[PDB]
């Protein structure tokens, strides 16, 4: 009743939903506390992060820095691969990825620079080529500079600066912190007080208003005690702004409008401590003596309730919720509460490899000087136990264990952790993300599924700026760990692999482990011996893939692994529309190529092992449905490749031209055509047969080459093209070209006679 | 090891060890990498028995190129660290990425030399890279001349204030002696570079550079009014070793085309 590709498409749809059901942060950080860690040595194949390279500060910057009379400062523009150094009233930028960078100097400023930041521009203000705004704060004024960070052939942005005539006098309040919103709003704070200022700017000059203005959103008055800021933090997904004070007070501001900022929550350390005391587990790691050293916003895409992480100097991660009084009038919260605490790990870093209650007393992260959190929970903590050497604790969610945990009430904040040692003299200054923000889904459920996106986005990389250079730290995926572990099993026994494989099964489950083996066998992780590793991965896929069984059947873990891998290769495509109507393609062509290559390498792997992999060759009811299921998946793979080739062919022509000369029903069918329908549903095939029948018609009008477009459609997308149609196309070729040559007398009798043949 | 080789007249083997070490990712400072390369260069320039002239020259050449780039990198690092207008925060960062393995000329230009407006070093970089781009080269020459002029002007001003009783801006080391006129400091910059690149470079296209310097002299009154020799631009390039025929040849072109300031009287 239901054909192969439609059966396999059913497996894909159910697999997509399974990946998108990965637990949300609120669900495994429920009210309470946790100390769950599995620590890994930094040199281990199981390390969750590792240093990939380092970039020294240019010598010319050292010359300027040691030529500093009063004040110097370093900072990071990790979004574009740039660092900067300020010396008194002078500023120097440079691309730290470049092996011998040139210094972009800016010395117009008259007074000492106290803060520098790179923010988005205000829309409709600057030319489109301006990608950022550079904010330079001195003791006398704030200065805006236009920035164009266009990528270069080498892979590092080319940076050019533009003047703006936009500037404002600072005033009496120091500026040490500058943050920007998605829409280009610029907020300021510093070490004089807790006031928050905003800089406005516009293109037009007016007689009643300048191009650039500044206002104090705090409206202070009367008696005020000493208190100032330690940092500012933005969350665009909630239109919120957070400040942290030197007294560890957390203030929340809501952007109720494009020019408004309203304080809506103020929570001092006493309030946090009172919440903490009402929890079941109180600890001497958090008292009235403890300081909060850093905040990190948690976006609404990641979690609904938990808004904010706060790091104590004892290494405790405080996770705070925020809630509005009502459900309708963005809606501003009015309350904030400490709900969940992740306590520090216990293992300390060691040169030599050392050998179930809540651990709420560890001093391993005491003192924590700096801290950072990146979605889906990557945590960097600068521990400063000694005044000369920083130690870096880095941890990630144990995505594999969180995904397998059952039932939901057993979910805990499991983590994989490691210690990265920096050499003597390295003082960490800042840590920033160099790759695109992580997101496996568009809502909390599914958001943190690292496993699902292993092959859709590069692993996260982080630039660690020190006083001596920039270190690049990279997140390691399961396939990276699996490949590395197998690389150590190349010189060992049959039982050595089985032992290493059992470690993975106990953490990730059998399906995820076999899917990793399949991926490694197909060359994933090799963008980083390699033939032996891929052959070991093949051996693991065969030997430990399981088998089908009667419970309706339960297919092998080998089958589920193939379905899981294939689904994740096309997850960005499946439910997406093919086109966007001036019609264009929803998915960039470059992305369609890589997806197709991945699908084809998977197909090539199955063909080269059709004889050794169970279920591929034909075989009692169990192995029967195993063969049918595997067959259906392989038919979907070839259909996926044909479908992608068809879309690429389509946009190589002039689709808008083809779309114009088309009937309404077929325009509408093409309007809401998804990749799933193209791959697995007859209407996509029928519509594909219409489009090919239409593109060739147009190709003949351009008349570049018919027989080349023929052999293009004949072979690659065969089984969807028909050989009786190309001969027809060859006939309509001479017919139209007989109408092209129509004025000629002797040339047609050969065109029309051959068209008739 | 290298000391053993050399005393045994095995200079090429030592040059090989030293070069590889200079290119390696071991923890070696830039200055030590400069010493290693400089030694390899010497050791590869002399005969080592049993080894072909071709193999010697190729190593001596790789060491010479890497040594040239290394010296550039060292000039940068030093200048940046000492630069009063660079924030301390940045300097530490510069020292980390420049006081280690030798970087590519692209990086040195883009991330450091161009950002800090060290145009003289930019020019040395265009030389080491065989950079074929007359327009950019001249743009850099124009920036170097103007930058140097403004700096000389500033220093003469400070001096004039000392000799009049006034006070200099906070944190300005006075000049106890008449600093050089701007055209003297500019030509100093041109000499330093010339000696470093040897006039045979593409950063000394006399047909473009001589008119620009002459242009500068006119448009900034670097002439008799201030007690300078009106022919100073010509003296400069002649002593520098530009052949007489080429000079006159260019000057002819200047006179025939009547461009920029070379017009009217």
């Amino acid at each position: 009743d239901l054909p192969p590709v439609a059966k396999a498409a059913q497996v894909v749809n159910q697999t997509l939903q399974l990946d998108d059901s990965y637990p949300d942060l609120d669900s495994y950080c429920r009210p309470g506390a946790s100390s769950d860690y599995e620590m890994q040595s930094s040199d281990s194949s199981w390390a969750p992060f590792h240093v990939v390279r380092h970039h020294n500060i240019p010598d010319k910057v050292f010359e300027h820095l040691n030529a500093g009379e009063v004040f110097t400062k370093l900072g990071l523009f990790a979004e574009i691969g740039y660092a900067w150094a300020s010396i008194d009233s002078s500023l120097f930028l440079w691309d730290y990825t470049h092996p011998n960078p040139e210094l972009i100097g800016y010395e117009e400023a008259t007074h000492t620079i106290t803060a520098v930041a790179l923010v988005p521009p205000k829309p409709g203000v600057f030319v489109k080529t301006i990608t950022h705004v550079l904010v330079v704060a001195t003791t006398s004024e704030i200065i805006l500079l236009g920035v164009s960070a266009t990528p270069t052939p080498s892979g590092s942005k080319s940076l050019t600066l533009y003047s703006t005539r936009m500037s404002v006098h600072r005033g009496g309040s120091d500026v040490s912190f500058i943050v920007g919103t998605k829409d280009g709003r610029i907020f300021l704070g510093g070490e004089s007080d807790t006031d928050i200022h905003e800089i406005f700017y516009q293109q037009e000059e007016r007689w009643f208003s300048s191009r650039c203005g500044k206002i104090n959103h705090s409206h202070p008055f009367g008696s005020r005690q000493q208190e100032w800021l330690r940092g500012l933090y933005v969350d665009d997904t909630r239109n919120l702004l957070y400040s942290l004070s030197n007294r560890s007070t957390i203030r929340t501001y809501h952007m109720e409008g494009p020019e408004k900022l309203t304080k809506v929550i103020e929570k001092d350390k006493t309030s946090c401590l009172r919440d903490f005391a009402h929890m079941a587990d109180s600890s001497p790691l958090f008292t009235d003596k403890t300081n909060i050293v850093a905040l990190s916003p948690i976006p609404a895409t990641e979690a609904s309730k938990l808004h904010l992480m706060a790091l104590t100097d004892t290494g405790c991660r405080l996770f705070l919720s925020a809630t509005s009084s009502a459900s309708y009038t963005a809606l501003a919260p009015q309350s904030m509460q400490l709900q969940f605490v992740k306590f520090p790990p216990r293992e300390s870093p060691t040169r030599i490899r050392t050998l179930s209650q809540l651990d709420k007393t560890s001093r391993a992260l005491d003192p924590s000087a700096l801290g950072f959190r990146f979605s889906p929970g990557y945590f960097f903590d600068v521990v400063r136990k000694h005044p000369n050497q920083d130690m870096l604790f880095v941890s990630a969610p144990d995505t594999g264990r969180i995904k397998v945990t059952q039932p939901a009430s057993a979910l805990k904040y499991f983590e994989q952790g490691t210690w990265i040692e920096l050499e003597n003299g390295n003082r960490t200054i800042e840590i920033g993300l160099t790759t695109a923000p992580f997101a496996a889904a568009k809502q909390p459920l599914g958001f943190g599924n690292e496993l699902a996106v292993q092959f859709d986005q590069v692993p996260g990389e982080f630039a660690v700026l020190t006083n001596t250079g920039v270190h690049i730290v990279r997140r390691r995926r399961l396939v990276d760990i699996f490949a590395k572990a197998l690389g150590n099993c190349v010189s060992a026994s049959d039982d050595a692999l089985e032992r290493e494989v059992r470690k993975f099964i106990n953490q990730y489950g059998r399906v995820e482990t076999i899917a990793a083996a399949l991926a490694v066998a197909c060359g994933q992780g090799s963008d980083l011996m390699d033939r032996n590793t891929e052959n070991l991965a093949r051996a693991a896929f065969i030997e430990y893939g399981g088998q089908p069984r009667l419970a309706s059947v339960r297919l092998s873990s080998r089958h589920d692994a193939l379905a899981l891998y294939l689904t994740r290769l096309v997850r960005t495509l499946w439910k997406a529309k093919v086109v966007q109507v001036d019609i264009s393609s929803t998915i960039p062509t470059s992305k369609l190529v890589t997806i197709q290559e991945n699908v084809e390498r998977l197909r090539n792997f199955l063909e080269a092992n059709k004889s050794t992999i169970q279920g591929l060759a034909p075989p009692d009811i169990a192995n029967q449905k195993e063969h049918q299921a595997l067959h259906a998946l392989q038919k979907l793979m070839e259909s996926i490749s044909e479908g992608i080739s068809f879309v690429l062919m389509l946009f190589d022509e002039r689709v808008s031209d083809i779309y114009a000369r088309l009937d309404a029903v077929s325009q509408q069918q093409l309007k809401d055509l998804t990749y799933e329908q193209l791959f697995s549903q007859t209407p996509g095939k029928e519509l594909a047969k219409v489009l090919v029948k239409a593109i060739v018609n147009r190709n003949i009008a351009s008349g570049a080459n018919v027989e080349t477009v023929a052999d293009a459609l004949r072979r690659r997308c065969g089984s969807f093209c028909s050989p009786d149609d190309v001969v027809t196309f060859k006939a309509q070729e001479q017919l139209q070209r007989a109408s092209e040559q129509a004025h000629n007398s002797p040339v047609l009798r050969a065109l029309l006679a051959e068209s008739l043949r | 090891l290298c000391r053993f080789y050399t005393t045994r007249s095995r200079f090429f083997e030592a040059a090989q060890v030293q070069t590889n070490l200079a290119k390696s990712d071991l923890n070696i400072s830039l200055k030590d990498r400069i010493i290693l390369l400089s030694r390899a260069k010497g050791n590869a320039s002399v005969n080592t028995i049993g080894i072909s002239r071709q193999q010697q020259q190729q190593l001596n050449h790789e060491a010479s190129e890497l040594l040239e780039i290394a010296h550039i990198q060292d000039d940068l690092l030093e200048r940046l660290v000492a630069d009063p207008r660079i924030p301390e925060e940045r300097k530490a960062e510069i020292e980390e990425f420049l006081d280690g393995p030798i970087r590519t000329l692209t990086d040195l230009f883009n991330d450091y030399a161009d950002q800090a407006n060290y145009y003289d070093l930019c020019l040395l970089i265009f030389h080491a890279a065989d950079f074929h781009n007359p327009r950019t080269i001249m743009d850099t020459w124009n920036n170097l001349i103007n930058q140097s002029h403004f700096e000389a002007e500033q220093r003469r001003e400070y001096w004039e204030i000392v000799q009049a009783g006034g006070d200099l801006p906070a944190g300005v080391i006075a000049p106890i002696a008449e600093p050089p006129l701007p055209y003297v400091y500019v030509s100093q910059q041109i000499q330093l570079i010339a000696h470093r690149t040897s006039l045979d470079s593409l950063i000394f296209p006399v047909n473009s550079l001589l008119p620009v310097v002459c242009a500068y002299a006119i448009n900034n009154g670097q002439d008799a009014s201030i007690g300078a020799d009106p022919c100073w631009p010509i003296q400069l390039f002649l002593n520098l070793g530009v052949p007489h025929a080429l000079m006159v040849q260019v000057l002819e072109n200047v006179l025939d085309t009547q461009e920029a300031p070379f017009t009217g009287r």
Partner: peptide, 19 residues
């Protein structure tokens, strides 16, 4: 590297503190 690659597109502002 003795090969130059100009890329004004995406640099790091030399005249600002870091994010």
């Amino acid at each position: 590297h003795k090969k130059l690659v100009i890329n004004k597109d995406m640099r790091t502002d030399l005249f600002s503190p870091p994010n």
